[PDB]
Design a protein around this nucleic acid. Structure first.
Ligand SMILES: Nc1ncnc2c1ncn2[C@@H]1O[C@H](COP(=O)(O)OP(=O)(O)O)[C@@H](O)[C@H]1O
Ligand code: BEF
Ligand SMILES: [Mg+2]
Lengths: 107, 93, 87, 575, 98, 93, 107, 95, 86
DNA sequence: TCAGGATGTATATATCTGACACGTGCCTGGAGACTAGGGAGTAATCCCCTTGGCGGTTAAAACGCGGGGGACAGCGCGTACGTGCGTTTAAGCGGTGCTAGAGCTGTCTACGACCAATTGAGCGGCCTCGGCACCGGGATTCTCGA
DNA sequence: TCGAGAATCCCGGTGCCGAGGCCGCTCAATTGGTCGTAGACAGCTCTAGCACCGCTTAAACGCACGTACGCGCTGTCCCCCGCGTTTTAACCGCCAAGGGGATTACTCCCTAGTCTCCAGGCACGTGTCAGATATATACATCCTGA
């Protein structure tokens, strides 16, 4: 009776088991399907893959080796898609996109 | 007492994206509260979809729908792809 | 003054002229009018009354006398301003 | 038991001394004594204390060993440090680099003694703007100097500057500032640099709680820094009196005596002089106006209510009202110098009572404060008294501390009293010109209570010291006094255990057993006003002629030719 | 006369400066005393985890920042460069915060 | 199939307020969707309050709290009064 | 074994039983307290009492015997409290509070 | 002939009095069906639905014009203009 | 038995109507360009609401949008709608 | 300011009718009685995170002075917009007929909830070094006058 | 349109602490059975949706004209910025105490069940009157003249 993890069977990096636990014990519905944890975990993986990828690119463009909150701020606000997703969110240590209105610049 | 989080997972995915990059502790906290957040939105939607049809059971098809409600546009299309592929490969074995 | 202090000013005057002015400068504002100050103290004090009211409520519900971080994160999460990073 | 400390740590005395760099011999093995002062010393006298202690510490350097000076106060640690370096590097002539780090209250002092008590060895200071510190930092940056003089924090800030240089023998003062090793100053010193030699100069050992005596003896010598964690519940056992004190305190405390012989060094004043005019320690009591006493009884504003740390609230109202504007508002609408300022408390009423004797005999007075604000109302109170005073307190300014010191040291000084800050007491001055010392407030640690307590009797004191504590009965403050000399019983098995060990005597410790145990037993007996001029005159006046010269004060305070405010504080403190 | 920029250049140089960095723009202790004051009224004798007070500070600064971006849009709309009280009261009137 | 609603209840309360007034069908529909709505808000709050403390059980005390979060000001005070009184009288018998 | 309704015991007009059913079978929490239905029902009663009262008053001021959507619109938007509560709501058949800006009126 | 602007006010009173739906049905229904062609095909609307969309959308545009009006008055003009609207939606956060 | 493929029907919203709406909102004097813009706005709005409605419908295995589904789409975006149920 | 007059607005009076308020039969969801067990309430315990204050330093805030730029006030123009009219049309209201699918019921059955055995994925503690802060000095640039 | 000079980037060296890699200890995730049920699917109705047509007319449209408001302009006065100088309160480091926030252990009673009735609440009829709806009348009100 050898064991193999549902993440491995899935080919995903999120802990499908843990998701399934959350869906059960959060009282979302009475009975959680068997595919739902897998599918959901896949989604979360995808999104985190996006935010991290963009962030890393940004940090590289600042020649920093590591990702810091400012870089999440910029990776989220530049991408228009995520901006639509996260639009209500206040990121800590955030900063703002550098922005200057047209009329303010001198002639 | 242990307080679980998604840290190490985010870290893996990072290593499969930018092999070089490190991620500061604060940023790891953000990505954490993120993933918990998005998770609550999705399972919320799938919940009250399971409710409006008087099904008792969250299944894959709901999660697919809810994902198509929350994520704008391209994220919807790709994300649906990721999911479908993943479930398929799950059922193969 | 020297003899007796009587120098207590007020808390909300703690946010100052140049502080507010810095906030604007981050906002993109270029030239600030002189009345904006007392105003922005007004706005700020309202916002804090709301958020803190809710956080306090959550806290009294758990029978704790310590307003934590998770609680403020919940009050904001409730008014739609969701904050990240604190757990 | 722990005797591996005795044998293993005597052979380990050989280890530190030779290898690393009856205990009266092996640790002290290299011997010498000289009564002849160093040639650099200018205009000075030699008592025997800085001699014996002198060649004892100098012996520790010859032993290549550090230590702590546990001595009482007024013993002139300055002079021992002067004879120290001036003698060592009068011999070796190496003369540097070596630094001392002293209290910001005493700086220009040290510069003064370094002026008149030795010319040959000069120094450099750090004060004022980072600009002046630029001038001397880049100027003498190159390292041409005898000695570095600094203060507590500037080693942290300047640490980048002056940390890059090697060191050998370092000196600190007021070692009880150290305490924790996690306190930033200590661990900075460790990461800062390395000096093969250290020392600690202080007026007392560690706190009653004594956890960190570990930390001290980490900073003293190599001894305990490896095993530190373990000894806690054993050594703390002193914190069936015969059985408890016997097993716990007699067993383990004897153990520590046999350990603590080659470390701490102390004596009394009677040892070096006998010039001490008396025991010069007394107290008095008082009573507070029931106006705020009614608030102590009910405490229905205090308990659930914005107020907080109601004990601190008490000590605030223990001393005096007018801490909050409304007191003056519904009470003294014009905030003018006014009655009930002195009639509100007992400290101000009986303080009025002592005033005519104060100016009468002209013997000067020190008044100390634990908390700041009180000194303000006290200043206004003297503004009504009109007899002048200096106001000294922490953080006031930089060098007007020194200026005020000069104003005091003038023998003609007309202003008799003036104020200090207990936290900044810190040997912050020397006083030979006064006798009476008055303490207020609480002082949750006695080491500072006694610290300022001892400023009065000073080498070359021609006056006769009298001292009184101002406490009001039926209040939390005499409760804290209780707790305070409760901690005199706690340290009585600690710092009164640690104090008497200098030359490693024999029967003196049992003299403290029988007679001291008669003192602790005497306060066991203890546990389980003076308005008439007669009493206060007696306790104060030091001869019958002084009693007589106080009859001229019987013509005014004796001869001499409420509730509303509490409803105001009940309603308006009724939040 | 000493070297003096024209009015408005110091402004822009700031705007670049601040929009570059992440620092908290309100000195702590004023803000913390502010919060404690406002919390006196609801319940009494609360204790804040310092992390909390940090949370309030971060939120509130993000809120005021947003508010000034928007107000700026209004002032530019009116062909003035100087935000004014009625600009703000407009902005909050549009978002629906009154 | 019967589709339940709160109609008759609203109608009773009406009769205990304005004995004269009738209420048109459309208005009855609105008051219906209202009461369902407010109900979902309150039980929502009480839910994830029961969650943030890791209690498993909605009780009266939560409902009291949630009511104090949603309803502004005076509605909070009075509504809390109504509730407390009602529960009390419930326990008396 | 005589029966008496929990509404009656409560002194309320909402069907406490029905509420309790909803709280159970909506998957709000796993275990619903015994007082919760009562308390909640009381609240709902109170609110509906408010909206109806105000509405009726309004209709009376229009001399109509019955309450119609317009009257709910006005009873909600005039009261500032409910306006704060319902502020996101679009009432059917609604209409708007009669409103005219200052500058538009002639001199 | 009235002066310009009086017919306006007389309208404003007229419409703010009543509840009628302000967009003729069949144009709106054909509009909705058109927009729904693109997502799925061959949908069937319960007429009650199309009524729902109409009621929402009219309430949304009404709000939008109250707000825009606030902006135009703010600029000391009485005439709403495109940049007024695009402002209003820029403030609410709808872009 | 057939479906006519539609276009240019947004013209269905006609200048008089939009003038009526603007009158209800309190607007006094309308500029002449507001019309094309408004048609833009409306078309956006209906695009969102109808895509969410259609989503719910697709989920339930129905070919028929229904008032419940619209009401949920509006409840979804944050504009609650009363009176049609749900 | 005062008036005639047209215009729309509000007022009183029959009438019409479909929406509502009510009465009846029916039946399922609520209420009551009884059982268990697990979650919540409460006591015991301890330690860390909070609070209060003071010392000591220095970067920021307050104050003020001058002057340049912009908000505001008025004026003149002309063009885009409202108003009214006559004309055209598509909405609306009413019918008709078809039928696709919304909606319910009757089967079974795959499948998800439990519950017990088993073990390594992940968690906390703890080393331990390089990326980043940071200073300092150098060079290069961007905003002002003459 | 050329210098001056105050910002700002850049190279290099330093140090330091927070990321990151490592290890033993669990508990939560696997496995692996069984068993009760949502739900999946087929089969039926019967309804509301669509499509169409014909008939009426209120509204939308095109247009003409007058006009008042949007907009550009200029001026003018004031007030917010930039700079320097004096002051102070924030900031970092101390010191202390004690109190709520954690845990753990134990108990007890509340609520989820479950089974058994039974009446409240719902579908469905039914009568009847409140508010359209229609005619006629009276009056405020804006516009233009005076
Ligand atoms: N040998 C001496 N001759 C005269 N006075 C002395 C001598 N030693 C010490 N003193 C007195 O001690 C005082 C300085 O003591 P200080 O160094 O402050 O003591 P400590 O450093 O031990 O607190 C001086 O005022 C001086 O009068
Ligand atoms: F510093 Be000593 F007490 F004179
Ligand atoms: Mg000393």
């Amino acid at each position: 009776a050898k064991a193999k993890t549902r993440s491995s069977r899935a080919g995903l990096q999120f802990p499908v088991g843990r998701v399934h636990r959350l869906l059960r014990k959060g009282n979302y519905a009475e009975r959680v399907g068997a595919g739902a944890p897998v599918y959901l975990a896949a989604v979360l993986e995808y999104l985190t893959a996006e935010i991290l990828e963009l962030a890393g690119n940004a940090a590289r463009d600042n020649k920093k080796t590591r990702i810091i909150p400012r870089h999440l701020q910029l990776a989220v606000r530049n991408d228009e898609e995520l901006n639509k997703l996260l639009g209500r969110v206040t990121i800590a240590q955030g900063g703002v996109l550098p922005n200057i209105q047209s009329v303010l610049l001198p002639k | 007492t242990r307080k679980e989080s998604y840290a190490i997972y985010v870290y893996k995915v990072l290593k499969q994206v930018h092999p070089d990059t490190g991620i500061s502790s604060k940023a790891m906290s953000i990505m954490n509260s993120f993933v918990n957040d998005v998770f609550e939105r999705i399972a919320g939607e799938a919940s009250r979809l399971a409710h409006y049809n008087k099904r008792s059971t969250i299944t894959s098809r709901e999660i697919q729908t809810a994902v198509r409600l929350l994520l704008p546009g391209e994220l919807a299309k790709h994300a649906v792809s990721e999911g479908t592929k993943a479930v398929t490969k799950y059922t193969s074995a | 003054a020297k003899r007796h202090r009587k120098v207590l000013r007020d808390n909300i005057q703690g946010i100052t002229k140049p502080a507010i002015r810095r906030l604007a400068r981050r906002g993109g504002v270029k030239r600030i009018s002189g009345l904006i100050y007392e105003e922005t103290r007004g706005v700020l004090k309202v916002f804090l009354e709301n958020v803190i009211r809710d956080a306090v409520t959550y806290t009294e519900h758990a029978k704790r006398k310590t307003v934590t971080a998770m609680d403020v994160v919940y009050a904001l999460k409730r008014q739609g301003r969701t904050l990240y990073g604190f757990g | 038991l722990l005797d591996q400390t005795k044998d293993t740590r005597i052979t380990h005395l050989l280890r530190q001394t030779n290898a690393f760099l009856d205990y009266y011999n092996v640790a002290h093995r290299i011997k010498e004594d000289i009564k002849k002062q160093p040639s650099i010393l200018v205009g000075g006298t030699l008592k025997d204390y800085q001699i014996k202690g002198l060649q004892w510490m100098v012996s520790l350097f010859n032993n290549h060993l550090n230590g702590i000076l546990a001595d009482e106060m007024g013993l002139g640690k300055t002079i021992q440090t002067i004879s120290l370096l001036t003698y060592l590097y009068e011999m070796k002539n190496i003369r540097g680099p070596y630094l001392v780090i002293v209290p910001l209250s005493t700086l220009s002092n040290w510069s003064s003694e370094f002026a008149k008590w030795a010319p040959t060895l000069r120094t450099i200071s750090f004060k004022g703007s980072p600009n002046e510190r630029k001038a001397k930092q880049a100027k003498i940056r190159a390292g041409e100097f005898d000695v570095v003089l600094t203060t507590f924090e500037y080693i942290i800030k300047e640490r980048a500057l002056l940390s890059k240089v090697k060191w050998v023998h370092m000196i600190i003062d007021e070692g009880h500032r150290m305490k924790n090793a996690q306190s930033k100053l200590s661990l900075t010193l460790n990461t800062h640099y390395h000096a093969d030699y250290r020392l600690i100069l202080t007026g007392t050992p560690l706190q009653n709680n004594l956890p960190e005596l570990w930390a001290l003896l980490n900073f003293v010598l190599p001894k305990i820094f490896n095993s530190v964690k373990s000894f806690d519940e054993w050594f703390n056992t002193p914190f069936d009196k015969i059985e408890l004190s016997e097993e716990e305190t007699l067993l383990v405390i004897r153990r520590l005596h046999k350990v603590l012989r080659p470390f701490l060094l102390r004596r009394l004043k009677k040892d070096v002089e006998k010039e001490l005019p008396d025991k010069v320690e007394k107290v008095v009591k008082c009573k507070m106006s029931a106006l705020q006493q009614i608030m102590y009884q009910q405490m229905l504003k205090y308990r659930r209510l914005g107020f907080n740390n109601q004990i601190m609230q008490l000590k605030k109202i223990c001393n005096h009202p007018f801490v909050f504007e409304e007191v003056e508002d519904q009470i003294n609408p014009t905030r003018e110098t006014n009655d009930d300022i002195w009639r509100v408390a007992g400290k101000f009423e009986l303080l009025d009572r002592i005033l005519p004797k104060l100016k009468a005999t002209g013997h000067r007075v020190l008044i100390f404060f634990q908390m700041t604000q009180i000194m303000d109302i006290m200043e206004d109170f003297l503004r009504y008294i009109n007899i002048k005073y200096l106001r000294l307190d922490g953080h006031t300014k930089s060098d007007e501390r020194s200026e005020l010191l000069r104003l005091f040291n003038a023998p003609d000084s007309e202003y008799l009293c003036f104020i200090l800050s207990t936290r900044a007491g810190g040997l912050g001055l020397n006083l030979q010109t006064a006798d009476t010392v008055i303490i207020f407030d609480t002082d949750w640690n006695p080491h500072q209570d006694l610290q300022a307590q001892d400023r009065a009797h000073r080498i070359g004191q021609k006056n006769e010291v009298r001292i009184l504590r101002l406490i009001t009965t039926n209040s939390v403050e005499e409760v804290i006094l209780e707790r305070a000399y409760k901690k005199l019983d706690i340290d009585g098995k600690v710092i009164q255990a640690g104090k008497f060990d200098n030359k490693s005597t024999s029967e003196e410790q049992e003299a403290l057993l029988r007679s001291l145990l008669d003192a602790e037993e005497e306060r066991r007996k203890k546990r389980e006003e003076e308005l008439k001029d007669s009493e206060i005159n007696e306790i104060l006046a030091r001869n019958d002629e002084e009693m007589a010269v106080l009859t001229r004060m019987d013509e005014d305070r004796s001869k001499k030719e409420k509730r509303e405010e509490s409803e105001s504080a009940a309603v308006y403190n009724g939040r | 006369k000493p070297h003096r920029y024209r009015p408005g250049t110091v402004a822009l140089r700031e705007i670049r400066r601040y929009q570059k960095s992440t620092e908290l723009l309100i000195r702590k202790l004023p803000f913390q005393r502010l919060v404690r004051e406002i919390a006196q009224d609801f319940k009494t004798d609360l204790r804040f985890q310092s992390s909390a007070v940090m949370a309030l500070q971060e939120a509130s600064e993000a809120y005021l920042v947003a508010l000034f971006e928007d107000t700026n849009l209004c002032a530019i709309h009116a062909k003035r460069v100087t935000i004014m009280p009625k600009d703000i009261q407009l902005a909050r009137r549009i978002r629906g915060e009154r």
